[PDB]
Amino acid sequence: CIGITDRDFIEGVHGGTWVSATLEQDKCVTVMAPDKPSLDISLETVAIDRPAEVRKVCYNAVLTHVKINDKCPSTGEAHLAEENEGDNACKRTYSDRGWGNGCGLFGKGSIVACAKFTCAKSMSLFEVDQTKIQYVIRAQLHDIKTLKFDALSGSQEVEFIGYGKATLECQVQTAVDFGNSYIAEMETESWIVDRQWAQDLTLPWQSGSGGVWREMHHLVEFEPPHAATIRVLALGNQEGSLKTALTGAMRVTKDTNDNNLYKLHGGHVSCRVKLSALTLKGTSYKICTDKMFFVKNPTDTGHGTVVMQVKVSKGAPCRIPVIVADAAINKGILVTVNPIASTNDDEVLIEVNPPFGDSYIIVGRGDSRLTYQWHKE
């Protein structure tokens, strides 16, 4: 974990002592106090629970039970029972009648055709209620306590030993605009897509409240009428199409435990911890200097940023000075807060959002600093 500096906590003349820390996933923040064991606090999981279904989108349809009806000129329109039943796709047209096809005169005869629509493979779409975004914080000594938080319920308080009663006021900060997005499910797999990207799909859809498949003509073809007959074809599968279009969109891993919870990879939680009156200990870290190197090179994140992993040899516990410049001054944005390494020969993550175009990421100071080239469009 990573201990808090002095400015990160404040002890009052009266009342209690408050801590302020922005905790991010896969990392941990520890708080120390004289004559007391350490308090380790971490953000374990940020999840979504059963987001409401909005619209299914059929990408593979199957036609069944075919019926065609005929009317000779001046005998009116052709009517099937299946025109009323919503299960069936129906077309109305007119055919070339005459002698060869047993009518009474020459001209266009009304012909109607219906077939039962059955959706073989569909794509579900879910809305995310942001006031329901769950996040879980674990806090243990060195006697564990697990704290289930909601986006709405940001204030959760917990009993302890020595530290007494704590009260945590926490806010959630999402990695991606969930009001411009959909959670999309296709069989075993799922992704985060644009709302508009789905709303602009040319496939048949069915609202979350159920109902009939709409605009069935996207996957059904009614070939030109003949004498008294029409060939109807269900179009081919379109899985390859969606799957190819679903590439440029990050996937969302399913849960191993509950298997109905969606885990967000990014995002962070900002916390204010109300504590009893007690004196903590502020570890003041030193900006790293000596040998560092890339465990994992800077690589794209699929949402406009880039993540790297570095290791330190000589630097003890030390802050890592990450900056992205065009010698000059940086123009980028350091995503990762407290980029600090606890133990030598230990790997650490650094995320960053560079300026669009060509820029250089610089990590560390002096000879032993690291430099990486980066382009962004």
């Epitope: 005929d70 009317k71 000779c72 009517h79 096809n101 047993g102 003949h226």
Partner: antibody, heavy 120, light 106 residues
Framework: EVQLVESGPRLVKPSETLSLTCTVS????????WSWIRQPPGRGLEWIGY???????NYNPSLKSRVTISLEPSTTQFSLKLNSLTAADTAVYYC?????????????????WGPGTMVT | IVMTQSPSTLSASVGDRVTITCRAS??????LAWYQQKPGKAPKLLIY???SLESGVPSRFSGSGSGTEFTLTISSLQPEDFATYYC?????????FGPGTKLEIK
Amino acid sequence: EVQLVESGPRLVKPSETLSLTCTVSGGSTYNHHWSWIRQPPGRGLEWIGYISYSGKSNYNPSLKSRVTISLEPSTTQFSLKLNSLTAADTAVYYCAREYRDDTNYYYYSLDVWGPGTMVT
Amino acid sequence: IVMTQSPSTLSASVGDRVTITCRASQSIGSWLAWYQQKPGKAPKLLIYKASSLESGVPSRFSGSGSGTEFTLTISSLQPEDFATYYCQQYNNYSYTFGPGTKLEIK
């Protein structure tokens, strides 16, 4: 909407001829096979035979010798002719359509039926 | 070609999973249809092509079979279903009916 209705004389003297007429309403008699069936009260159904528009008819082997079925595409009413008739023929006579999709191989049926005529 | 049904008579209760059998004089593939006629009216088509169903038939009804033997089934018997049931043959030419199993209340 498609419906079938048969008619004629509901009372005939033995060893004579028979003239039933199945009029087809709400549909074109260009398609399908146009079929007749009978049912002697107390007993079940026996398939009599069918006729295409083109005129390729086909009858039940036990009766063909005494049966003619004509097809008028004009007035849209296919008709049944049973000569040398006896009291065994006294029954209910349904005119029904078989089916033909052809362009799709969705085939099998006897779809629309008439109420049937009681012939003696 | 001749069709034979078994039973010809049945006494069942509203809810019974009833099963009527129908066998042909030879192999006719999957070509077989069932019919439901209540006394007075004209026969009404229920099943077509062995197992496929016609729009207008309750889902309790279910047929199966290919080749030589075919069966009907009503999952949970219902009032209107008390009727006489027939079967059909294809030949590629000349068709044939069955004797008809009369369904009757217990």
